[PDB]
Amino acid sequence: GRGANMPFTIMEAESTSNATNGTKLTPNFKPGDYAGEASGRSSVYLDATGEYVEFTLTSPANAFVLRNAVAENTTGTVSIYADGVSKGKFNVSSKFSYLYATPSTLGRLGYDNAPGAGLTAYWLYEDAQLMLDQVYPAGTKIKIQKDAGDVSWIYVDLLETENVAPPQANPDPTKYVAVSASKSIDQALTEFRQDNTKKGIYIPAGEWTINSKIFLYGRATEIVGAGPWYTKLVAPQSQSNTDVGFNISAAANGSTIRDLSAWGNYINRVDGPGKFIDGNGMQNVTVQNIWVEHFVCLYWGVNSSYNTFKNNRIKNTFADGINMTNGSSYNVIDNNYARGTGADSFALFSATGSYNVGNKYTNLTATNVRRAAAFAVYGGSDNLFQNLYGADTLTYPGITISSYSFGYNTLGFGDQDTVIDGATLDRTGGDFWTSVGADDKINEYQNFGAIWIYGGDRAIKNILIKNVDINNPVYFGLMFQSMSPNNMVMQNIRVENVNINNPSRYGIKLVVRAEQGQGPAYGGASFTNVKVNNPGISAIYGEAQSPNFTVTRVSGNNW
Numbered sequence: 040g041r042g043a044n045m046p047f048t049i050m051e052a053e054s055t056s057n058a059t060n061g062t063k064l065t066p067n068f069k070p071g072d073y074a075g076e077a078s079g080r081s082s083v084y085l086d087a088t089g090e091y092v093e094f095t096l097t098s099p100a101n102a103f104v105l106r107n108a109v110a111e112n113t114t115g116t117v118s119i120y121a122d123g124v125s126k127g128k129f130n131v132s133s134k135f136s137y138l139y140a141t142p143s144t145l146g147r148l149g150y151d152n153a154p155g156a157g158l159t160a161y162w163l164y165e166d167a168q169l170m171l172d173q174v175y176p177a178g179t180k181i182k183i184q185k186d187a188g189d190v191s192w193i194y195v196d197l198l199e200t201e202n203v204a205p206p207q208a209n210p211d212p213t214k215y216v217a218v219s220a221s222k223s224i225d226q227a228l229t230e231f232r233q234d235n236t237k238k239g240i241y242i243p244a245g246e247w248t249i250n251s252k253i254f255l256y257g258r259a260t261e262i263v264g265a266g267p268w269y270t271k272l273v274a275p276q277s278q279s280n281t282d283v284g285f286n287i288s289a290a291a292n293g294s295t296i297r298d299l300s301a302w303g304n305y306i307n308r309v310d311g312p313g314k315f316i317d318g319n320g321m322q323n324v325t326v327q328n329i330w331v332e333h334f335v336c337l338y339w340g341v342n343s344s345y346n347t348f349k350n351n352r353i354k355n356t357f358a359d360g361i362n363m364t365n366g367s368s369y370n371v372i373d374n375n376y377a378r379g380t381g382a383d384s385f386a387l388f389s390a391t392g393s394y395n396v397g398n399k400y401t402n403l404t405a406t407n408v409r410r411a412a413a414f415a416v417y418g419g420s421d422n423l424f425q426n427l428y429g430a431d432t433l434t435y436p437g438i439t440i441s442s443y444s445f446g447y448n449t450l451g452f453g454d455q456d457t458v459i460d461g462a463t464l465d466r467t468g469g470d471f472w473t474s475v476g477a478d479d480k481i482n483e484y485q486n487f488g489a490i491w492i493y494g495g496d497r498a499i500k501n502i503l504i505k506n507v508d509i510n511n512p513v514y515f516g517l518m519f520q521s522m523s524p525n526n527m528v529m530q531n532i533r534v535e536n537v538n539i540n541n542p543s544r545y546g547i548k549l550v551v552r553a554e555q556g557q558g559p560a561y562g563g564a565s566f567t568n569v570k571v572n573n574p575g576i577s578a579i580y581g582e583a584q585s586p587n588f589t590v591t592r593v594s595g596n597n598w
């Protein structure tokens with residue numbers, strides 16, 4: 040029960056509770072693979088008419104999201120049945136999936152949408168959303184079945200089920216200017232700004248074009264939809280990579296955007312444009328119960344403080360889900376669900392104001408991270424990451440804790456703890472970068488544990504990791520590394536109440552030589568009640584070869 044508390048239930052297609060006459064994939068950790076990229080590292084392949092996967096509802100549902108893979112450059116249907124009776128068709132498509140690179144150019148993952156000579160397809164899964172005209176009770180058999188006229192083949196990865204309430208009306212037509220078939224979002228906002236009795240705008244159920252960046256100014260503005268399944272803001276879908284959404288000027292600090300969805304038209308990553316909400320320096324803004332897809336990011340804060348992002352769904356983006364940078368402090372990032380981000384799902388990048396401080400990243404779920412980490416913290420002071428669920432990273436840790444500057448002006452970690460408290464990390468880690476001349480070499484890449492503690496070129500200190508379960512990480516549970524030649528001494532690094540279950544290589548790795556010119560870790564870390572269970576090779580690697588690093592076994596360690 041770690042992570043976000045969402046109204047939808049997620050059921051893996053391959054669950055043993057699901058009858059099927061299709062083909063259940065054996066798991067692997069390979070990017071560019073229909074198993075490796077699936078939630079749970081497996082899917083059920085339906086490849087003939089009449090092949091099905093049968094789900095059983097554990098909670099009532101009238102609405103469904105099917106994560107699936109179909110052929111490149113295709114659209115079509117797959118059928119849904121309730122208790123053996125056909126009830127509709129999902130619109131399945133690869134419009135937003137299939138991003139191309141090569142095994143040695145994973146730095147391009149997400150950027151390049153066109154197939155080409157010698158190029159491998161990655162980011163193979165996408166989603167289909169469907170609402171049915173009845174609430175089906177728990178115990179209903181919901182069958183996904185490939186009938187005549189459906190797509191030639193489909194990998195079924197998981198099903199979201201949800202009991203969606205009826206749409207919520209305009210809270211008060213005399214205070215919220217309604218968008219309508221003949222009144223645009225921009226026109227409603229102009230009416231709002233020019234009449235001080237208005238609190239904001241209401242966007243009814245429907246599909247509403249957002250073909251521009253919509254600027255909020257004048258004063259604090261409320262933007263209220265009917266619910267994310269009902270109010271859909273849609274980037275022009277015959278265009279691609281249009282920078283649309285909202286941009287909140289300082290005059291509109293204190294605004295609220297809630298209860299709606301935003302459907303972008305990005306088909307690859309672009310660096311600069313592409314955040315659904317822009318709000319450089321924004322303060323006291325609330326973004327609540329919105330569902331956003333196919334943007335580069337939901338939000339990328341820049342000295343943005345005292346904001347609240349709550350109850351949101353961030354799916355299938357081309358870079359970070361939410362990042363808060365360059366002084367962003369005292370933000371509440373609470374109870375958000377991310378799946379399929381294109382870079383760090385939830386991130387905090389501290390830079391020069393000296394540190395990002397006082398942020399609370401709580402009750403967060405980040406899964407199917409298509410590049411980089413589920414959670415990432417780059418420097419900062421007095422920031423909390425609490426009750427996290429991360430799973431199924433393609434290329435990188437579940438949690439990155441790093442004092443590398445990336446060339447920006449930053450002091451690294453500060454004098455108050457950065458705390459990871461309560462986290463479950465399932466099948467996290469992966470391959471990235473290169474390992475030429477590396478120690479402990481198993482392939483052409485650097486190899487990443489579920490949690491990466493990386494001392495870079497800035498101070499690495501005051502890190503507390505506690506109450507973490509790490510299940511079946513690709514390679515390692517905890518991976519400690521110091522950048523040479525800087526050799527920053529890690530101080531006050533403590534690990535408490537951690538279970539590392541079935542890591543394929545080591546429970547703990549102290550990186551001895553990541554690549555040519557690099558050396559072992561500097562400083563130390565303490566371990567209290569850290570259990571390593573059934574490691575593939577050994578509980579800990581690198582201790583005897585890291586003479587500048589002290590492992591302190593306080594108590595309760597079985598290694």
Ligand SMILES: OC[C@H]1O[C@H](O[C@@H]2[C@@H](O)[C@@H](O)O[C@H](CO)[C@H]2O)[C@H](O)[C@@H](O)[C@@H]1O
Nearest residue numbers: 308309310311312335339358359364365
């Ligand atoms: O603060 C660093 C820069 O952040 C943003 O651009 C990011 C870019 O550097 C790269 O990391 O990709 C992400 C996602 O597309 C970009 O958001 C700002 O746009 C840029 O002005 C900053 O210098």
Ligand SMILES: OC[C@H]1O[C@H](O[C@@H]2[C@@H](O)[C@@H](O)O[C@H](CO)[C@H]2O)[C@H](O)[C@@H](O)[C@@H]1O
Nearest residue numbers: 443445472473485493495520553554557
């Ligand atoms: O050195 C410049 C690059 O630094 C970072 O990436 C490092 C990478 O090059 C390799 O050496 O591995 C280390 C980790 O062991 C990486 O941190 C930046 O991420 C990259 O953008 C720079 O080009």
Ligand SMILES: OC[C@H]1O[C@H](O[C@@H]2[C@@H](O)[C@H](O)O[C@H](CO)[C@H]2O)[C@H](O)[C@@H](O)[C@@H]1O
Nearest residue numbers: 130131132134135167168169246271276
């Ligand atoms: O061509 C636009 C769009 O069509 C499909 O998605 C539908 C979406 O437009 C509408 O708002 O909701 C429908 C029911 O949930 C969706 O099926 C395609 O799936 C999508 O790729 C495409 O952009």
Ligand SMILES: [Ca+2]
Nearest residue numbers: 078079081196
């Ligand atoms: Ca699955």
